[PDB]
Design a protein around this ligand. Sequence first.
Ligand SMILES: O=C(NC(=O)c1cc2ccccc2[nH]1)N[C@@H]1O[C@H](CO)[C@@H](O)[C@H](O)[C@H]1O
Ligand SMILES: O=C(NC(=O)c1cc2ccccc2[nH]1)N[C@@H]1O[C@H](CO)[C@@H](O)[C@H](O)[C@H]1O
Ligand SMILES: O=C(NC(=O)c1cc2ccccc2[nH]1)N[C@@H]1O[C@H](CO)[C@@H](O)[C@H](O)[C@H]1O
Ligand SMILES: O=C(NC(=O)c1cc2ccccc2[nH]1)N[C@@H]1O[C@H](CO)[C@@H](O)[C@H](O)[C@H]1O
Ligand SMILES: *Cc1c(COP(=O)(O)O)cnc(C)c1O
Ligand SMILES: *Cc1c(COP(=O)(O)O)cnc(C)c1O
Lengths: 810, 810
Amino acid sequence: QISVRGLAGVENVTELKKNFNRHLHFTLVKDRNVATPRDYYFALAHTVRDHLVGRWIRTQQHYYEKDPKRIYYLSLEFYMGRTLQNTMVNLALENACDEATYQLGLDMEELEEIEEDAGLGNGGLGRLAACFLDSMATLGLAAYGYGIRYEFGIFNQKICGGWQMEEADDWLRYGNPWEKARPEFTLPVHFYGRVEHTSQGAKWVDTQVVLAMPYDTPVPGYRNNVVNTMRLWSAKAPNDFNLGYIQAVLDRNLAENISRVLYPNDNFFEGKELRLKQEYFVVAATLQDIIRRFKSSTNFDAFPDKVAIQLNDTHPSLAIPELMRVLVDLERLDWDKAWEVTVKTCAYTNHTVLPEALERWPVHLLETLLPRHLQIIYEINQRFLNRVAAAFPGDVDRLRRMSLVEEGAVKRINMAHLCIAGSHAVNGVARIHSEILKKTIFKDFYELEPHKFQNKTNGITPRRWLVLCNPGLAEIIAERIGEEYISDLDQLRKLLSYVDDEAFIRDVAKVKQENKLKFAAYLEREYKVHINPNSLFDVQVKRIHEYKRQLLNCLHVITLYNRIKKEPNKFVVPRTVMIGGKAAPGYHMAKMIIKLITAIGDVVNHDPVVGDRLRVIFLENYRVSLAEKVIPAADLSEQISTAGTEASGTGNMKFMLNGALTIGTMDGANVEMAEEAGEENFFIFGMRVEDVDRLDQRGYNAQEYYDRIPELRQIIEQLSSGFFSPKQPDLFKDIVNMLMHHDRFKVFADYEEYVKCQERVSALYKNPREWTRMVIRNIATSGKFSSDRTIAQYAREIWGVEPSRQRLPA
Amino acid sequence: QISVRGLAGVENVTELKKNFNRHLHFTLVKDRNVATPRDYYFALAHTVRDHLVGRWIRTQQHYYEKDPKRIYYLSLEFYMGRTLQNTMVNLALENACDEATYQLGLDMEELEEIEEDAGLGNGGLGRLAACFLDSMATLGLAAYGYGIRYEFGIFNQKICGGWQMEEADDWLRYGNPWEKARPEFTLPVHFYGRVEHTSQGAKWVDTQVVLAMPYDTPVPGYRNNVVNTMRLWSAKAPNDFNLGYIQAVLDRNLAENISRVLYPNDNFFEGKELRLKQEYFVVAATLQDIIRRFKSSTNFDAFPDKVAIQLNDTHPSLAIPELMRVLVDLERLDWDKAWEVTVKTCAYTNHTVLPEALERWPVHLLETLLPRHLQIIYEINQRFLNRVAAAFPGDVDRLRRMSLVEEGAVKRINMAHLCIAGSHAVNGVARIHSEILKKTIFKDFYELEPHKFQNKTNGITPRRWLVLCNPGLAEIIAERIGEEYISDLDQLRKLLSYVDDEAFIRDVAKVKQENKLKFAAYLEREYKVHINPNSLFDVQVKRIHEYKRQLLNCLHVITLYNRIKKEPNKFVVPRTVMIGGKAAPGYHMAKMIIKLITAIGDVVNHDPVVGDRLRVIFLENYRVSLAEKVIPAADLSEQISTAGTEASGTGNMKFMLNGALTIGTMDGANVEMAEEAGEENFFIFGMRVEDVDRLDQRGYNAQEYYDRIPELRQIIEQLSSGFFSPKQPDLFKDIVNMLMHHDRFKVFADYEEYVKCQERVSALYKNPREWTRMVIRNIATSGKFSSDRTIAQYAREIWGVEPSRQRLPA
Ligand SMILES: O=C(NC(=O)c1cc2ccccc2[nH]1)N[C@@H]1O[C@H](CO)[C@@H](O)[C@H](O)[C@H]1O
Ligand SMILES: O=C(NC(=O)c1cc2ccccc2[nH]1)N[C@@H]1O[C@H](CO)[C@@H](O)[C@H](O)[C@H]1O
Ligand SMILES: O=C(NC(=O)c1cc2ccccc2[nH]1)N[C@@H]1O[C@H](CO)[C@@H](O)[C@H](O)[C@H]1O
Ligand SMILES: O=C(NC(=O)c1cc2ccccc2[nH]1)N[C@@H]1O[C@H](CO)[C@@H](O)[C@H](O)[C@H]1O
Ligand SMILES: *Cc1c(COP(=O)(O)O)cnc(C)c1O
Ligand SMILES: *Cc1c(COP(=O)(O)O)cnc(C)c1O
């Protein structure tokens, strides 16, 4: 149908049809008489999967022959989403499969909706890992993603009586065609025990053993015949575990619980033992795998020349002391040499400056679970602090600030401090964030070792986030500038010479309208909710957090409602306000915010005077597959975090690429997005980082804003009096109390500028031609935010490897 | 190589080779450079599996079109063993696969040894179910085996310091190519809750739900293109289960523990809640499946015309009240009609008369777990006892004897009584056993309903137990009488005209010698134990039980040792005495018996004066795959249970078919085996059932035998003094105490006759020609003991269906 989806050659279509029928018969044990849509999905998945095999085997043997430096990306989260369409896109099989299925009497888009998301992440950090894998394969790097195969990913969200309910994400129930179990490569992981000091160094003895069984998933590059590997570890009990008899067999569950479920708390670090076990589990199994592969190429001087380990936050930070443990205790290297190798091997990426999110493990937990690692951490700390003392003589407070060990009621290990000490490179994820790290939380470390600190601005893959989710836009771009931009996104700059092109203006607006119509139809069919497709689609989708200020959006919504009620017969630009995202199960305030959004909808959506001029919808179960639907449909992207709190954001980049305009603060990557597009093409409002600092020095008094802004006062009175909860008048008392007395994120301080800025959005939307021209200026300058750019920078500036767009033979 | 293994056609071999290579590549994601023997096994399994698919689909659609009466075989145990060779045998693919693999540079026999046994049973009862499935498919019956997919089967046995150690049988670790998961056919099973009595009958409410997910395994008939199904249920938690958050997800393990492990206690009924859950789990899921299939052919009058349910012991006895529950509470049938349907549908097979093995469930357990079923059981009991009272007026003691409810400290439900009341047919498993049921434990029930009581003598499948395990014997038989005997075992009678045939005598002896050489080589390679292949192979393999009298065998072994020590320079017929079998983990005496056997070996095997004249070996980890190796190698089959205790035995039949002579009591099927072969061709010794009864009336005094038999006295003195345990002199005090004071199975009473009979065995073995002639007379009369005969009798006399050897189109 469309060019970017590839060729549907007669020979290919014929072969796909027969292989589909072969799998339906031999693999699924079904015929066309009893087969269901799910059976058809699986037949197609197996058919497409077959095309990966040759490339997967030959990519891996190519790495063995050429022996390049290997990149190991360690993460507790990989937010992959669906695999079928992405695989077809990267193999140029989409049109051929569409034709093959069509000739068999099937709708491929219907089959695609059957696949479960691989939801092995919470949000941004997990999705970044996924985009990175796609980019590393596209750029021909010898890269491996290592993580945990959770039996249950991020919970499915149900909304019941306006409240979030959590249900288990049983994503493996029907099987996973994309993984290959590798039981033959199972490795042991050790826990508990004790340290014995002998004549020839320390020995870690009397341990309990859990087995790590790998499952491999192919990661195809974009049309370069490269297929890399994501290896996820699953926990298995040894066969003599607990070996009255029945109970011993049942108790195997305790060991296997390590890989059972993803921790869904992305707001607040909780020092839970099971989480610590998960972190060591992935680190210990992965490092054994790395060392084995290195030995199968005695001398560890060349280790950092052949191995790079990237730590996705501090979650896999135990890699540092584990590598030291193996090198010192098992390989018998001297400490100084092992440390040199470790530092040159490891690099650390930070994703937030919020203090409550930072990992600070109680010493007593590490003492019991990982006694040798604690001893190694203590030794690292002493040697590090001796360096600090030598560089800054007499600065005793610096010594306590920089220590890996934090004193207090309970002693804790600061895992970020461990990561900085043990890595040759530390990076933030957007320019402003990286600067904040050097000026604030890691200031002391920057002063000691300035060369370690870098920036790597985040990005998104244009395969999933344009070609896959928005083929209509990809095609109209391809018609003008060709197909090369898909792996070279900077080429989008060529679209600037089309800003006054009448045909292109019409085509861009048409694609958006089609996407909006499709999403409006999705909402009616799956949820029975009615929306006006002609309204401005105002979208805020992301995890629910106070710092992300969904509450500020709520205040604007109520403002618009109140203004309509005051002047009913005055024209306003119609809006559909959509808010979606999951709340961490133990985050009370976030759960209250969800209830508020639904409560506002209950009032607004049923007011006859409002009509179709304002609609408020909570998008249930926001996840990767839903993002792929809603982002192409969006007109306005809400990126409204308090300046200095969102490290980067990546949803922002997805919206920019797909033809939405952005209303945002100068926070995270918003700054660079505005820099690329031009400030005149961005709806920028509110306090800058410097303004927040000034307010903190003075003291934030929310009462001041309440007293001076009548429209804000009305909203607070409505919330407190029970206007949005008639049967439970004091339901939102916690929200009001927080806003008035304990608001860390200064919601009231940005209220006036936000509402005014929103008025300017509505003004521009009244002029469809000028709206679309500004959209074109955004899409055309989105090139910097390709994860291909991000990965090329990691490769050149941290890992010491050169990317390549050269094809492997098919 | 050999005729019975089929043709190796050029076209077939070529196609098998290419499909092997296709699976190694696409399915296993390997090439010949990195593939291991295990990978090669899996490639072959997938290749052979492909040949089942068409036949499996067309068999099932054939049953849908013809709509014959369906047979449902309900069992908690299916002892299947390995599947690869059996599938090849039944599809006539063995020679072709042998050639295909040979041309690829692989030894098929080496690949076959990689497959894990499906050890989903304890012994005889579980293996009977497996042989029955094979026979039902071979006889063209529309039959379904229903059971539980245990994650862990019967434990692997390790011998450490002479003691049994148990380790988990993790049989699914590398995957199971023979099962097809059917998640789409998942059904709910209900537990706990309470009964509510409304205007329109009882309702079972407030239950907890566990899901039953089926896995289907193909059961191929012998070269008739029939492929039936074994459906095994796996336990799954519902997605809202327990739905702080983390714990709720982890707690899903509690529901899923239902299908975790096979109970290994085959000696003593233990009223454990988890076992009760397993029994209801299989019954509830199965009956829903049956009713659904019946409705997809309103009127349940035709139910017994279309459905037969066979209960393998009382383990699935809850089928009776569950069927009543569905018919009365859900379908709204009146009680009397539902009861008529139930009785005509169900039949019960008993497997033991030992009181401690009979299921007697505490009422309090059923009250809590299955409150509606208990109410139904009470109603069944009242109506049944009203019938007893009408037939035998004034016989008050008969009423308490026949009650389903047993009074005492704790009230219990006798599940055997439930089965008899609710079944139209009750059978024992050998003629003597069936007679014992009518004269003793079920005497009252036989007097009330004599027409219900039947015999169905057990059998074994000649596919697994001759063609598969002993191809050399199968071939020499086939050379004389053709191939038809494999599905018509009565044809073996034709071999009687070869008893004086010099060529056949030589061929039978040669095959035995080859089998003995092969097994002697197996013992050296896998266990490093040395045996003399020229010695008489004296074998007792079966689960360790006091009633099976491994201890009597032990006494004979020590007798032979003592006689050698007394007269060292006298010739004795050399023997290798092999004893193998698992003990239930909580059966102390059985564990002591294993230790005794190894302790005897430790003394006997290292005595220089003995030399190679006597060797005692404990065969570790006895299981189906090991039985297939040792049985063909055996000269003497030990079947020495106390008369009246072994219901049938089936190991006895396996040995008879494979050219061993039998030393045995007149117990179980031994009686019929001796009847078929002629008593002159069997080594029969010891008390008959009548002799045991006489001794019980008088009182068994072991001291009498000890006082009157000097050779027995010596052995007891050796055991007590610490001759077989020098460092732990009183190790065997428990065994001596039991034998002297508390022996339920009268070991001493059969000692003298046993030793004398064993002397006659040795005498015959000195004459190779006459030994072999007697062997021929045994093999030639083994035909009755085909499970094809057994199943034909069940079909005609219980199920009301006619078997067929007619082929389905390929
Ligand atoms: O597709 C699958 N087929 C079989 O397991 C199967 C076909 C067949 C034919 C005859 C006899 C036995 C047979 N068995 N299995 C799925 O293969 C998926 C993709 O690898 C797995 O994720 C999933 O766990 C597994 O259920
Ligand atoms: O997604 C992020 N963090 C987590 O998911 C997270 C789970 C967790 C568990 C325990 C302790 C800490 C934890 N954190 N950070 C995002 O990471 C994205 C990728 O850099 C950024 O764009 C975005 O600004 C940032 O908020
Ligand atoms: O044989 C199997 N192959 C795969 O799972 C597989 C091939 C492949 C190629 C590219 C990308 C992904 C891929 N995945 N799976 C086994 O299939 C067996 C037989 O059905 C199962 O018992 C067992 O659980 C399962 O591991
Ligand atoms: O194998 C048998 N029984 C069991 O495995 C068994 C497990 C179990 C658990 C709880 C309660 C009772 C239990 N029992 N019985 C054999 O069943 C065989 C098949 O009929 C006979 O040949 C043989 O004589 C007989 O001993
Ligand atoms: C991109 C993405 C995110 C990250 O969004 P931010 O707005 O940058 O926090 C979270 N969840 C999903 C499903 C995503 O796709
Ligand atoms: C046949 C068989 C049995 C039953 O043997 P009996 O001697 O009849 O108790 C037990 N275990 C296995 C593995 C068998 O094959």
